[PDB]
Amino acid sequence: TYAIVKTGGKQYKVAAGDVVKVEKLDSEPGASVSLPVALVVDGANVTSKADDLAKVAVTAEVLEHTKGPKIRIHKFKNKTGYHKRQGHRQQLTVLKVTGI
Amino acid sequence: ARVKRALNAQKKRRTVLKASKGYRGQRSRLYRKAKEQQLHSLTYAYRDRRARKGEFRKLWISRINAAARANDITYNRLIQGLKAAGVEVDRKNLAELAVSDPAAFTALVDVARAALPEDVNAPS
Amino acid sequence: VIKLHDLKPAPGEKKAKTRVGRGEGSKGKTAGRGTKGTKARKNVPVM
Amino acid sequence: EFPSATAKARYVRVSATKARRVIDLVRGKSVEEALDILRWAPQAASEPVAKVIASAAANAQNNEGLDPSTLVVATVYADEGPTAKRIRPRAQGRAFRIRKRTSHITVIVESRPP
Amino acid sequence: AVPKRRMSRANTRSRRAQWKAEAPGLVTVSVAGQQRKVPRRLLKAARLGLVDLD
RNA sequence: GGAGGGGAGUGAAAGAGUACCUGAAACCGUGCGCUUACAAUCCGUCAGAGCCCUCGACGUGUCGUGGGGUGAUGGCGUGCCU
């Protein structure tokens, strides 16, 4: 069995035990969070009705807070002399799914 | 006090040359050509980061269309039926279901067919 | 006990000097003179 | 690893590329066949290379006490030495530059089982 | 005519690789007892002792 | 033949040998790993099969909140300065 969980404006296909990187959540490492579900596929029958989805939720534990890859931005335009250096490291949380 | 320009220039030269490893020809050896190629490469990376979402969405749409046509339904009618049925699964997980779990995609196709109106061309 | 290293100027009493012609970041390739012309080279008399 | 001995000829008054042309003929060959090849090679750069190879073989046989019958030319290459600048006067008063290049030749022979 | 552009490393090396020397073929010979290698072009000369062999 | 070098020594160090403190870049080699002879390439960037290396866990090879090198192939892409 597995389910599609919505978090941070995106959806991820997860089952029990999967580790998935997720947009930053205000939770301390080692805590537990409950997230909505966009679809449940248990064996063969597929749960897709809105109220059935509302009746279910996915519980996962926060592993650690991490950072994404370093992204270098150097905007540039020729015959202009315009440069603009900039960096960015997106913050992330690592979630281990406990059950559905 | 007289100041020599060695260290200050060597710093940025080292960074630029290290960032240009793997390039072909003068673009990996000489600082000026490597700097030009760095400008071009970072501009290309910035543009491709924006375009990658559209590229992946196009690929997912292609896979979903292929899988739906394998179930005797067009992509647009399937999307309209899914929207009517209220299922909110996006195209990424739809393509994942199509590739990995054909039975789930068939069930979703069935519910989309159920949700569609009787006459799609009616002015309703 | 105020020592020689505890002496600092008043807030905002020192200002950093602006050095022109030091790259496009602050004032580069023109030093605030625009394109060519009489003013781009020497000066224009007041009278 | 195999036992080995090396010899070096520095500031050999031949250009590096011309020495490499000869050297590329004796890579991986045994000492005796390389010596014969250089002896019958129709190039003037073969004499210094043959001298280096013979010196390396003698160093291996004498100082390390290795059997010359098992010697093999394992590593050999020619680098660039200091070059001196000359002037060749030309037509209409112009002067051109002439480079008198040298080279260093390095040879490493080693004992390999038959 | 003068070259309009500087030749890249790849083209220069690829054309430079064709300037090479071929290894002459050697056959053995028996002179004064000891065996040694001599090109087949000089076989008869070596047998008559007309070639200085170090 | 010399030049030069290999042992042996002096030296704390010869990666201090009167071409000698430190020894960068351009430029020229040697060895290894990947790739390249049906292919129209501002030479990169985004996806990316395969091969090699490496860090953990469990067995005997197979994954992972992994990291690296090279990259067949597809999309995009008209060098810098005045």
UniProtKB/Swiss-Prot annotation, chain A:
GO CC annotation terms, alphabetical: cytoplasm; ribonucleoprotein complex; ribosome
Give GO MF terms, alphabetically.
rRNA binding; structural constituent of ribosome
Describe its assembly: Part of the 50S ribosomal subunit. Contacts protein L20.
Family of the protein in this entry: Belongs to the bacterial ribosomal protein bL21 family.
PANTHER family xrefs? 50S RIBOSOMAL PROTEIN L21, LARGE RIBOSOMAL SUBUNIT PROTEIN BL21M
Its job = This protein binds to 23S rRNA in the presence of protein L20.
Which BP terms in the Gene Ontology apply to this protein?
translation
Q: Which Pfam families match?
A: Ribosomal_L21p
Entry coiled-coil feature ranges: none
Please indicate if the UniProt record lists Transport as a keyword: no
Question: What keywords are annotated for this sequence in UniProt?
Answer: Ribonucleoprotein, Ribosomal protein, RNA-binding, rRNA-binding
Q: Which InterPro entries does the record cross-reference, listed alphabetically? A: bL21-like (IPR028909), bL21-like_sf (IPR036164), Ribosomal_bL21 (IPR001787), Ribosomal_bL21_CS (IPR018258)
What name does the UniProt record give this protein?
Large ribosomal subunit protein bL21
Give the species this sequence originates from: Mycolicibacterium smegmatis (strain ATCC 700084 / mc(2)155)
Curated annotation (Swiss-Prot), chain B:
Q: Give GO cellular component annotations, separated by semicolons.
A: ribonucleoprotein complex; ribosome
According to its UniProt entry, the protein's GO biological process terms are: ribosomal large subunit assembly; translation
Superkingdom, natural source: Bacteria
- Tell me which InterPro entries the record gives: Ribosomal_bL20 (IPR005813), RIBOSOMAL_L20_CS (IPR049946), Ribosomal_protein_bL20_C (IPR035566)
UniProt keywords (A-Z) are: Ribonucleoprotein, Ribosomal protein, RNA-binding, rRNA-binding
Which SUPFAM superfamilies does this entry report, sorted A to Z? Ribosomal protein L20
Give the GO molecular function terms.
rRNA binding; structural constituent of ribosome
Do you know which Pfam families this protein is assigned to? Ribosomal_L20 (PF00453)
User: What does it do?
Assistant: Binds directly to 23S ribosomal RNA and is necessary for the in vitro assembly process of the 50S ribosomal subunit. It is not involved in the protein synthesizing functions of that subunit.
- Tell me its family: Belongs to the bacterial ribosomal protein bL20 family.
Put simply, this protein is called: Large ribosomal subunit protein bL20
Q: Per the UniProt entry, what species is this protein from, by scientific name? A: Mycolicibacterium smegmatis (strain ATCC 700084 / mc(2)155)
UniProtKB/Swiss-Prot annotation, chain D:
* Gene Ontology MF annotations: rRNA binding; structural constituent of ribosome
Q: Per the record, what is one GO cellular component?
A: cytosolic large ribosomal subunit
Q: Output the GO biological process annotations, alphabetical, semicolon-separated.
A: translation
Q: Does the keyword Repeat apply?
A: no
Function in brief: This protein binds specifically to 23S rRNA; its binding is stimulated by other ribosomal proteins, e.g. L4, L17, and L20. It is important during the early stages of 50S assembly. It makes multiple contacts with different domains of the 23S rRNA in the assembled 50S subunit and ribosome. The globular domain of the protein is located near the polypeptide exit tunnel on the outside of the subunit, while an extended beta-hairpin is found that lines the wall of the exit tunnel in the center of the 70S ribosome.
Protein family (similarity comment): Belongs to the universal ribosomal protein uL22 family.
Can you state the subunit structure given in the record?
Part of the 50S ribosomal subunit.
Record protein name field: Large ribosomal subunit protein uL22
Q: What is the lineage of its organism?
A: Bacteria, Bacillati, Actinomycetota, Actinomycetes, Mycobacteriales
List the gene name.
rplV
Swiss-Prot record, chain E:
Q: Name one Pfam family in it.
A: Ribosomal_L32p
Q: Name one GO cellular component term.
A: large ribosomal subunit
Alphabetized UniProt keyword annotations: Ribonucleoprotein, Ribosomal protein
Domain of life, per lineage: Bacteria
From the UniProt entry, list the residue stretches annotated as the region Disordered.
Answer: 1-19
GO terms for MF: structural constituent of ribosome
Query: Is this entry keyworded Signal?
Result: no
Bias kind Basic residues: ranges: 1-18
Q: Which GO terms describe its biological process?
A: translation
Q: Which family does it belong to?
A: Belongs to the bacterial ribosomal protein bL32 family.
Q: What is this protein called?
A: Large ribosomal subunit protein bL32
Q: What is the source species?
A: Mycolicibacterium smegmatis (strain ATCC 700084 / mc(2)155) (Mycobacterium smegmatis)
